[model samples]
Target: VSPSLIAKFEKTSKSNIEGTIKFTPANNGTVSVSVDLKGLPSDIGPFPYHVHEKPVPASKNCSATENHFNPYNGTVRAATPAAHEVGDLAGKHGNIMGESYKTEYDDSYISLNEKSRSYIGGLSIVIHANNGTRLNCANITLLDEGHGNANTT
Candidate 1:
């Protein structure tokens, strides 16, 4: 756990959403991810939420951000060099409900080996409207060495 997260932001016209992304190293070859979204508008119900490409630049919202993390410059999908770009979460939308969110994926790509640790170090967690539409996001830095936890309940 980099840092216990609690963030707030202004609601834009097109999208009104905010949340925190907590990452934890798992015993297996994966990182535990979780988020919480609130103050969302009803117009865009049930949209796509994911770890997008590129880091959170000085832009206002998540749209300005690039696609998912694909260090390989491949398509925005799962487990590709391109997928590990700046903030690519394996090309999958994070599990986001109306205001609740959760994600769990094996990050073997991080270590790139059975006994190595991946680049779950520093990345941004995004909350998109749908299909990669930017809404809001938070820059989360995952410490490569330690135990972590989130208090969403």
Candidate 2:
């Protein structure tokens, strides 16, 4: 088992959501994604989220993180859940909304190997409101190199 990668969510202008998303490498070569969030606002349906390409700026502008992590730059504009990029976290996994949310799933699209397009390190996790609005952001980083446990503030 490879070390876990974690993205720690931070507050944004429109919402106060905060939490940590842990990505662990499973035996099947897929990543086991676990999310635990707090302060999710009401009326936000489906709570779109994605693993963006770039990291958040020092200013913490979620927009600075840029679009979804599309290393091939392939049909990025495709908005459908089926055509989403490999780094499309929620698109490939799932989404949720609540004051506190928790879920887990195995995603074959992600990898700990830096050579893979789905390499998660140095990436940013963008939490969306509904369709296309940045709510909160966090940078993925190395947590426990041996056991793969991602925990953050």
Candidate 3:
């Protein structure tokens, strides 16, 4: 198993909870990411996990991150017949837990290669408050360590 890229973001809510993000590199361009949350006030029930289009714009509020990552190398949204965005994770379900959750995807999900529209490079990982609201988040980069079929960027 390859060591993954891990990052932790401090909660921004008034309660100031904290959470961690991890990216485990897998074979055939597959990846497993886990988010561990702790010290979160019980009031916080649900959270959203997503790969944003751009990097976290500011530390104060991570609003600058664009809509869901959709590169559309040649695809569109699953919901709309014409609104397919490369970032669309249609028909797929992500995890939401009070304490922790994890999500997994293949190279077809997100790319680390520069040629990959979903490469996740130059972007940021965001953890949202209950119901997809902005919350404390962390940022990290995917480096091609010459382990997989990805070309080192």
Which candidate number would show the highest TM-score if scored against the true structure? 2
Per candidate, the number of residue pairs that clash is 20, 1, 10
Question: Residue-wise lDDT of candidate 2 within 1-153, one digit each (tens)?
Answer: 455799988666666888889988887687888999988875765687888888988888889998888765545346664466777767656666767899998887778888775688888888887767778889999876443256433
lDDT (C-alpha, whole model) for all candidates: 0.48, 0.78, 0.55
Pairwise TM-score winner, candidates 1 and 3: 3
TM-score of each: 0.56, 0.82, 0.63
Report RMSD (Å) for each prediction in the order shown.
Answer: 6.7, 4.5, 5.6
lDDT of 1 at 150: 41
Q: Which stretches of candidate 3 lie above 4 Å from their native place?
A: 1-4, 11-15, 41-44, 73-91, 100-108, 142-153
lDDT of 1 at 76: 45
Instruction: Please identify model 1 stretches exceeding 4 Å from their true place.
Output: 1-15, 72-94, 100-120, 142-153
Candidate 2, superposed: residue stretches over 4 Å from native: 12-14, 72-83, 145-153
lDDT of 1 by residue, 1-153 (tens): 223222233456645665555555566644555554577654564554444445566655565555555454545455534343334443444345565444444443433222322343334556655554666765545333343364333
Best-to-worst order by lDDT is: 2, 3, 1
Instruction: State, as a TM-score between 0 and 1, how close model 1 is to the true structure.
Output: 0.56
Error of 1 at 100 (Å): 4.1
